[PDB]
Amino acid sequence: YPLSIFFIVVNEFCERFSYYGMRAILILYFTNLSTAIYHTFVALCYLTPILGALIADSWLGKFKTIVSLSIVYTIGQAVTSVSSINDLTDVHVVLSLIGLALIALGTGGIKPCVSAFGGDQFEEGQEKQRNRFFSIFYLAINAGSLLSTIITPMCYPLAFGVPAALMAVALIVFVLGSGMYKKFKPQGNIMGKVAKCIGFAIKNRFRHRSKAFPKREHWLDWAKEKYDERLISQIKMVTRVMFLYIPLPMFWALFDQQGSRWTLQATTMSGKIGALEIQPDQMQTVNAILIVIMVPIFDAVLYPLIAKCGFNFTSLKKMAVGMVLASMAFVVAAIVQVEIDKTLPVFPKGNEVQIKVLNIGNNTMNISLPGEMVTLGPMSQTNAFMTFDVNKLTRINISSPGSPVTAVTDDFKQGQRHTLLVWAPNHYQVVKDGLNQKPEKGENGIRFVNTFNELITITMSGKVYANISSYNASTYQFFPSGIKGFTISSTEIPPQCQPNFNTFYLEFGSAYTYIVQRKNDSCPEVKVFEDISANTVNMALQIPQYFLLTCGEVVFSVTGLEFSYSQAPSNMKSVLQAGWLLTVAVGNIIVLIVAGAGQFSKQWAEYILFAALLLVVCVIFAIMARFYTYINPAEIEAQFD
């Protein structure tokens, strides 16, 4: 029996491995809305499966569609790669756009058919062996995911071309197994038959308003009037099973959160392990690492042990329990979410304005501000931002001991942090900061200030600041952690001056401002001032919140596809798979429905998003589980004719 299986398993592992490659690249290629864009196309890929089962069981069977959809899948990836080269080498965008739609079909028509195809090989009441396959099969899906991430860092033609090539390798091997596959063909228009049967029955029910209206079957009492009984039996099994899925999709909206929402939180939690220098975006991989080792344990020890004590868990029992751990997983995040709040600074909102003042002169200056004054010595700054109201910024006076007063006639934008630089009694400057949140992806911004009469130019690892006016600062640019070297160039600088310099360790999430000042020998000097503190909380603390979800998703997901396959009738095995996959499609809509948040504190969203909904669904789902939909032995009922 294993012979024909290996061709199938290696195909999915090889296939889905390449599939993940396109994911990270796509968002980078085009560059809150990232949540929509990331989720929108994720759901889109799961609408196509609708086109999968219909064609598969109503036309050419299952073997043909896999081969056909495999070819069209590769073309989409290949076309997108070359079309991208056409735009840069030489309307053009239209070529790239078409690839996306073509790529989706393969991603859609393959997932349902492949799963149903594997199960067919098991026929001799091989409950344990067929289940072993599904446990093995799911372990293969994440195997590709793990390898995809590690190779991604190590070009566009190869970035797109190379992943596409593997699918061809996967495609070729699957063909070789044709002589060994156990395959079945359709015997008519199954989809059409059901369509007509449903319409006639309900139409008949509409008739006889008060004549034998009480139905002994909610729908079948009327369908039987024209159609074959065993035909009614098959639809009856599928109709009941599909009902149980109504409460399921909410859960998938609770698992996807790790893709973006948690990764966003990883930005503010970058306390780096001493041993290594893990990056923020790599945390998602931790789900892959656990799942490969966790899956064998459950099948190996846990399930046999549970049997010994006589708990006798059923598929329904596990699925209901599986949702519990996922729910409890999120509340752990909320604990971590509130914890970080003790360290992150506060940013202005709307009509609020935050002000920072930095003195770079050689003499102390006195600053007059609405309802308060600040005196800052040479090369000194305020240790924290000062918040103010836009309307309350009425009078601003600047003076130095023994110097005339100087007013400020500039303007400030509400909702933007502003910095005031003063170097002489009547010489000041107003500059915008640009950033009003934690830096994206964890990198730390850097800028510079000009004090010399002439323009200056500075370069630092592929990024250049040039033509900077005197007593005016540039805008921030972001660099990774560690230590970076930089060089300066300016006409006023004599050649003999040394422009080579090095920085201190950067860590993650910090924001420092440099200052350039003249030495007695005309050589420049470098001073550093902080604006935002470095991230403190360690990143490994996300492991707790991760383990429960992955441990809970192994018990849930594995049973989901297996239980969907068993209850399906021998004729419409693939159709139900669409229902199962269709569950995920709805899920991403709910998170998309979030749109704006009622308030700002993220801790609220992390909590109500699961507790008020997921648990309520669980109890509601349990009620439906009380109606023993598992009591259907789909394998034997057909034997009754």
Numbering used by the authors: 12 to 42, 50 to 108, 120 to 183, 197 to 683
Reproduce passages from the article.
HsPepT1 was captured in the outward-facing conformation, both in apo and substrate-bound states, and in a substrate-bound outward-facing occluded structure. In this transition, salt bridges present on the intracellular side of all previous outward-facing states are disrupted, and a new one is established on the extracellular side, leading to the complete sealing from the luminal solvent. (C) Further bending of TM2 allows the interaction of H57, S302, N630, and D298 as a crucial step before (D) total sealing of the extracellular side and switching to the inward-facing occluded state stabilized by the salt bridge R185-D323.
PepT1 belongs to the solute carrier family 15 (SLC15), also known as the proton-coupled oligopeptide transporter (POT) family, which consists of four members in eukaryotes: PepT1 (SLC15A1), PepT2 (SLC15A2), PhT1 (SLC15A4), and PhT2 (SLC15A3). PepT1 and PepT2 are best characterized and mediate the uptake, distribution, and resorption of di- and tripeptides in the body. PepT1 and PepT2 are secondary active transporters, which are energized by the inward-directed electrochemical proton gradient. On a structural level, human PepT1 (HsPepT1) is 708 and human PepT2 (HsPepT2) is 729 amino acids long. Both polypeptides consist of a core transporter unit of predicted 12 transmembrane helices (TMs) of the major facilitator superfamily (MFS) fold and an extracellular immunoglobulin-like domain (ECD) placed between TM9 and TM10.
